[PDB]
Write a protein that binds this ligand. Structure first.
Ligand SMILES: O=C(CCCC[C@@H]1SC[C@@H]2NC(=O)N[C@@H]21)NNc1c(-c2ccc(S(=O)(=O)N3CCOCC3)cc2)cccc1-c1ccc(S(=O)(=O)N2CCOCC2)cc1
Ligand SMILES: O=C(CCCC[C@@H]1SC[C@@H]2NC(=O)N[C@@H]21)NNc1c(-c2ccc(S(=O)(=O)N3CCOCC3)cc2)cccc1-c1ccc(S(=O)(=O)N2CCOCC2)cc1
Ligand SMILES: [Ca+2]
Ligand SMILES: [Ca+2]
Lengths: 120, 120, 117, 117
């Protein structure tokens, strides 16, 4: 149920393939751009989740460098997939920027994204 | 400077290859076990970091399933590599477990790991 | 301003707070008497006038006269005024643990509070 | 118990706190007078007696008589007693933002506090 296209509340889109081995691969597009806003993503998911109605744990990373831009940053999303008629991926994320040592204390933003199969 | 073996304060070891394209691949071993405690990891890093003395942003994911165990969970680490004589990868992480909807509010642990090239 | 009163999150919890002129937040958090806990925090009592939210934070230690969970939650966020006022937060819930278990001491999450249930 | 007093973190900040019998934390955070801010929080005033830490949290809004950063930090953690006493924390720093910038409103980090600099 994970493979395909997902949309969050900020207008971002990612397109992921969930491999039988637990790999996540695909692309993440930040809301504003087209090709210039598309970045590689890779991650992992639980390919044998519980059958007790629990979600499926997963995570992925995007480094914000592509052939157009480099924001010297990387975001990781950690969350779970919840299936059904209104499938969701509920996540929390950490965005770390490369900083000097003096600024390391303010290197990392935290937030939360909810992804759905249809645009908000 | 990222490729190789790193150790954190909990006794965990990971071994990563940083690809020229920005890929991170390797294995993460939780402290206690041998093969039963080794898990696939994948991630991304900034393959063209700033040259102003800033760290190199990166992130990776481990899903805690292998051929021996499955904890129905996944951890993402977000941080930066800092080079030099005492190289470090400074991270913050999110560990999400698959949960029922009723328990989703307590699905995600947060913490921090510092990795060095030598065992603590 | 706009913060004093009763707030409700998505989980069905009730946050009753007084925002003092001095930047203090005081009140109670109900997550029945058994479920009511003291809260105290701080807010920016002179926020920007450029349309930005009002930064704030508070803590609940999960001990009252009835129960003790040996844990505490802190919420960090901002108040956003207007017709559909909100307090948008992220929180950290730390449990007392042994040193061996300290790596898994802290949960993270997010709550949105509104003025209506 | 063991919490009242002065604490120092790895960044050179100074945390001066009184832990009240009722579970209250009050004091000041210096991150000079210009750099001193009010703090208030809560702690578990009847912690477990099994070797677990004592859960606590506090907030500083970064406004004082000299400066206002339109932001607030909450620390969530636990006190660990003994010869080498510590308060181990993780924190959230939320800045007031526009709604457009709210996705990047909140920094996360960690501080360790000790009784000696
Ligand atoms: O794409 C990014 C990073 C996006 C982080 C998104 C975070 S991950 C967690 C959260 N979830 C999301 O879906 N989005 C956010 N930055 N790009 C921006 C740039 C930019 C432009 C050029 C360059 S450069 O060519 O390398 N250049 C810079 C220095 O001068 C010369 C070299 C680098 C960066 C400029 C402005 C804004 C962005 C940006 C910021 C936020 C988002 S967004 O997706 O968060 N956003 C969508 C629109 O509504 C607001 C939120 C997207 C792009
Ligand atoms: O390996 C894991 C998950 C590790 C999460 C580590 C987190 S990531 C963030 C932080 N950084 C680290 O390096 N470590 C921690 N769990 N395994 C444990 C199990 C276990 C055993 C069997 C199975 S099963 O076969 O699937 N089985 C379960 C149900 O019954 C039938 C099926 C599943 C899980 C049991 C006990 C403990 C662990 C565990 C927990 C913590 C760590 S640790 O690395 O955090 N740790 C090292 C030792 O000192 C304490 C900390 C390692 C393993
Ligand atoms: Ca930026
Ligand atoms: Ca467990």
């Amino acid at each position: 149920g994970i493979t395909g296209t997902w949309y969050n509340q900020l207008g971002s889109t990612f397109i992921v393939t969930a491999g039988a081995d637990g790999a996540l691969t695909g692309t993440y597009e930040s809301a504003v751009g087209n090709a210039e806003s598309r970045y590689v993503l890779t991650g992992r998911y639980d390919s044998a989740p519980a059958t007790d109605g629990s979600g499926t744990a997963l995570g992925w990373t995007v480094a914000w460098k592509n052939n157009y831009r480099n924001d010297h940053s990387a975001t990781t999303w950690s969350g779970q997939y919840v299936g059904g008629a209104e499938a969701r991926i509920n996540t929390q994320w950490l965005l770390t920027s490369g900083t000097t040592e003096a600024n390391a204390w303010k290197s990392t933003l935290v937030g939360h994204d909810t992804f759905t199969k249809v645009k908000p």
